């Protein structure tokens, strides 16, 4: 529990290598902590998160939760 | 894995480790790594 | 003084017959202090009954093989080994094993006397083949803990009585260790956690439950001493 | 050797003690007091007593 | 030289016990602190500077 | 199957060290007791000790007074070793003065009623002709040791000097597990659990006491019912 889970393999199971993964976690990771910096407003903007978390939970171990649970796509533009 | 049954000098136990490596997921051989270093020392503390 | 932080127990049950307790906090030290006499006490402090002697009949005690049984004589055994049994004589006491003919001999079918019982009736002990005929005589007794075969008594008493290993106790298997707990104030306060297995008969609670007994009377046999001595008092 | 260790100039009985000093009344007709170092700094931050 | 501390080893002052813990080949058999067992085989003991 | 039952009796071999006989205990059996035993008894034995000093004219560790021979941190040392006794809760003082020259012996300390000094013949300080000690100490009582900043006070003031303490009555635990091979038709042993206090109490108090502390946990052990 905590920096070891979840499993490497897991998450690299739903990507490419590494180094896609650590894009995608991160970009995942910066959209969660904007909609939580901006939540006093009345704001229709980001979206999340899509998981049960704690009361206060780094933006990251959501963001790779997700990503292991298959709720998130990702694309090339 | 399959079970031993040969003394394990230093020779014998990389070929092990690197045999868990090739074969197994990383969470599994950190595991095996963290049982093995626990009783390494337990019974270096009593080998004599 | 006073402890100034009760420590708890608490228990978690992986199977029908494997329990995990956790003890905490306890102060710094006395992790190691009740963790080994825990084990010893659970290991080889409690009363037990179990086999003593077989004698097969139609086989010396050369183990070459068993006529009409596929098992050789040390699967045999191993076999009877695992046979839990409960008695209330004290004295030795012998039951009969008959089954015959071809299939699977198991415990159920032992015929054993007024205040003995088996708490495993299918267990298996081995198979028939050939029409074969299987006669055994099972003595069983009370004891405490684990004792080697014991040897020849009487060179000149019988041929065939085998002895075998007596595993008494009904713990079967028990470990423990020791971490640190505390966050808030100083840590270094110590817990421990004990993993106990134990056989079909008993549970691991009344195991834990007649260690402490054990312990406590023990302990109290030297607190006798001079019984208005200031220890470390509790509280509720 | 050293110089650390304060040594007796010339023999005699000594005639006061005390932990800040030592008074002693020389054979020849001559009082030596010797003042002793206590709680002092050497170069390195470590302490001279 | 080596041969007067072995021979040395054996007539020391034994103690309030009247035993010398430590053998004729300078091992000591020593307690367990957690444990309480005894350890399997003697060990080394003595003074350090 | 075996009805015999343990027991435990006692030996005396001087004033202040005891050998307590336990028997007929099981197989493999004395090494854990004997040791659990000596763990309680070097841990968890309660006592007192002086926990801060004042003198007249001093203000801190780092002086020497006027007329002794020594500092006053090798004053702290000395006064560290003093085996006394306290019956009060609260903390106690303790006053010592001498004048003129000769040894500040442990009995020249005058203590209050309910309080003791254990070893009058330790030596504190020399004083020559010109010397005069006057100091003041605080006794409290616990168990184990604590390190003279657990003692620094909130209002502390600039005279006043905490000082370790060290509360453990007892000097020196050992035990052997004679395999006596106890006659009972089979395998048993024989705890003996020697025992030295540092003649502050006796060792059968120190026994009492560790016997009182191990009930208590073996018996919240066994209330799991």
Known sequence: EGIINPPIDELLEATDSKYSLVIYAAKRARQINAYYSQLGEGLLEYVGPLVDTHVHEKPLSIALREINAGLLTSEAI | ?48 | MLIAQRPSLTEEVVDEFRSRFVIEPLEPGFGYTLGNSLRRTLLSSIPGAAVTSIRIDGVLHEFTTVPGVKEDVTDLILNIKQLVVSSEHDEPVVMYLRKQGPGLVTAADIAPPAGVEVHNPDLVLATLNGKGKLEMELTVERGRGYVSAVQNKQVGQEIGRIPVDSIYSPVLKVTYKVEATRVEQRTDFDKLIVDVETKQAMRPRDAMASAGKTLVELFGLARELNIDAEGIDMGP | DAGDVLKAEKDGVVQELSADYITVANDDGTYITYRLHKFSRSNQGTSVN | REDELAGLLNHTIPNRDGERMVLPTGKARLFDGRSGEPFPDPISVGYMY
């Not at chain 2, 480790?17 to 790594?33: C, F, G, H, M, S």
């Open chain 2, 1 to 48: 894995y399959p079970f031993v049954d040969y003394s394990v000098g230093k020779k014998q136990l990389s070929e092990i480790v690197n045999d868990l490596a090739e074969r197994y997921p990383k969470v599994i051989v950190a595991a095996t790594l963290d049982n093995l270093k626990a009783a390494g020392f337990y019974w270096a503390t009593r080998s004599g």
